[PDB]
From Swiss-Prot, chain B:
GO terms for biological process: amino acid catabolic process; carbohydrate catabolic process. Substrate binds at residues 37, 122, 248, 269, 298, 302, 325. InterPro entries: D-mannonate_dehydratase-like (IPR034589), D-mannonate_dehydratase_GalD (IPR053379), DgoD-like (IPR034593), Enolase-like_C_sf (IPR036849), Enolase-like_N (IPR029017), Enolase_C-like (IPR029065), Mandel_Rmase/mucon_lact_enz_CS (IPR018110), Mandelate_racemase_C (IPR013342). It catalyses: D-mannonate = 2-dehydro-3-deoxy-D-gluconate + H2O; D-gluconate = 2-dehydro-3-deoxy-D-gluconate + H2O. Changing residue 300 to A: Strongly increases activity with D-mannonate. Slightly decreases activity with D-gluconate. SUPFAM superfamilies: Enolase C-terminal domain-like, Enolase N-terminal domain-like. This is D-galactonate dehydratase family member ManD. Changing residue 298 to Q: Abolishes activity with D-gluconate. No effect on activity with D-mannonate. It comes from Chromohalobacter salexigens (strain ATCC BAA-138 / DSM 3043 / CIP 106854 / NCIMB 13768 / 1H11). Its EC number is 4.2.1.-, 4.2.1.39, 4.2.1.8. Its cofactor is Mg(2+). Mg(2+) binds at residues 196, 222, 248.
Amino acid sequence: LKIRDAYTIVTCPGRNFVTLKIVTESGTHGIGDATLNGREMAVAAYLDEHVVPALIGRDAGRIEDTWQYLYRGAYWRRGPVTMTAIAAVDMALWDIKAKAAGMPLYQLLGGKSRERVMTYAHCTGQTIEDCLGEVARHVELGYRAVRVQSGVPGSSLPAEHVWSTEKYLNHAPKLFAAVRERFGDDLHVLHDVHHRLTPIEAARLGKAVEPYHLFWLEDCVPAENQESLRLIREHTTTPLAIGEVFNSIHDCRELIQNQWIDYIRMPLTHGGGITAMRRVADLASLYHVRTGFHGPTDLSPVCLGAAIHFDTWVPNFGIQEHMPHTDETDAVFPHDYRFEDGHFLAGESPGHGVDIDEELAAKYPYERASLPVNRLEDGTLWHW
Amino acid sequence: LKIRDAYTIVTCPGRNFVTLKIVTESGTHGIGDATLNGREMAVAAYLDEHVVPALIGRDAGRIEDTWQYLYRGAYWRRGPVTMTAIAAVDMALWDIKAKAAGMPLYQLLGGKSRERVMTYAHCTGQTIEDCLGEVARHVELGYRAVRVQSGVPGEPADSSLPAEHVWSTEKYLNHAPKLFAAVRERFGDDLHVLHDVHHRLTPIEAARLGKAVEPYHLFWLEDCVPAENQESLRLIREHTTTPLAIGEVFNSIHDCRELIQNQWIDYIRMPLTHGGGITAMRRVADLASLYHVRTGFHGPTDLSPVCLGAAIHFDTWVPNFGIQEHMPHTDETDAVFPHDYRFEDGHFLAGESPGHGVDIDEELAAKYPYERASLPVNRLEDGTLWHW
Ligand SMILES: [Mg+2]
Ligand SMILES: [Mg+2]
């Protein structure tokens, strides 16, 4: 049916979320995540001031046409703000389509390819032992996979961290050796290098950690230049993951087609929604590349519900990141996905199974918060 | 000197502009264009809510560090909203540095490479004849180059919400060569003639057109095909020697690195306000120069006099300058943005005032409230949402 109303909701139940809600003339509604961490109000404005008014009166069933209308119609294509706005609309429209079909989203997409969706948890410590304790506690929660991180020896506005590549490189292998010593070989172990290396440095790290058989080594190098992955891929057999900072298939087409990565990390709310990410996943599948959606707290339960539905259907699923939201957040975004024994189970309610309690949301006003920056020991502004 | 204040100014003296002003503890100020046509408030919010607060107290002289701080620090990199915000800061900081150095921006950049900067004018008509009359009017004004567009038998942001146009590729391909033939027939060979295909063709269609217009020796054929996939240019380049221009919709060197390195284009069109400012555009221009590629900055009304003045300075220094688009701003716009660049005999002359030579009259700017205006969309005859 026709779109009668559309508007954003901004709320901060432990952290900032922006949500787009679309309401048809029949009263059926859908919501989509529009949260872009540290730049939230840019997306809110992109929506409120430019997209939202153009949605009014459109046929809500025309998902593809609306995607193209917003993507091409913007004239200025791609980008974090642009593609997050588009994702929010797309996610809301799929929510409405699934409701109209009377099916949970995963059925609409082609049905379930699996009975449960494997997640990984974050295990972080100041020391290696601190980290190991976190691994133990997540293993007990039923997690089959853990991302491990420990300190390297030696906020409203961005916090400023200090970084040393060489100290990190000499130290990191010790962490994975420790994990394997304590927990053995069955456990999937992931590591996020978080953009801090050059390609030949990452190649060195990849080789160094081969004996520990990592599930992936993530975001080795900044990849605006996709060729950056080539030296890494040519020098190590440690699996590679990338893409949480991407927003377009055009950010990763070459990475995938040249087989320079094993996992694509771009999530629904930043990658143009269901419509676009279906195309990204399908391109990946031609090259044995699997999905590994970014799943931090800064993607709302709306994205997570939609992602679990997507994960349930997509043939080339790899893994789903899990960073639990706060109780307050979960309360603001009632949902029917559930977590059991290290895995998500998709909801059965028509739609993506997530809603937003607007009354509750209104109790948590926006509070500005920025991501940190990283500087080298000489002060050079680096990659965080 | 530290940044004491920073804030945006929104004004609509004939069309919308967003401007960033940065004021240092000494009271010296600098401005930068932040205008993103049809999405203006997204950049205003990006600046107001997330960038401006972080600028206070920063060393205004650290242009490079601030660029990297905003680019890398945002975590989410590239994009039209993102890079336009960064460009506004960068442009304002270069303005302040030039003022501090007591020289016009072109001097700071390495000095004058030319005595004047050639422009082209927009010439449009419903009929070929109408267009030819516009060509004549502009040659009399002293323009040495013209971009020609006419109707196909069978201020772009002109509506609050997007207008919907209808398009036929086949009709355009059959018609366009007739326009150029007529232009050459009437005006001869000396005149530079440009044409903007404006994203509508597939590569083999653009290859066909490029070949068809070879006899008319166009200065460039612009935006033949959407180029998110940079490989899109390859078939065109392999099939025609008509020169190619691309990039007004780009915001990053990573949007055009392969285009340039493979020699698939002759002119790069990404302008200062959308391509991350002077800092980023120096690097793009320099990459281009290795491959004989020249600058052809987008210069529509929707880039403010602030951008234009800085662009004219940039154009004056950059060795691999190609041409500067000129779409004249309204008298009201020129009044809100006093500037010392001048247009004479088809060319721009850079100003001599320290800074980029442009300022904003805030009192006058406040007299023209924001008015939403959207770019049109384009649909094929069957209703397919196409490229405008
Ligand atoms: Mg990560
Ligand atoms: Mg153009």
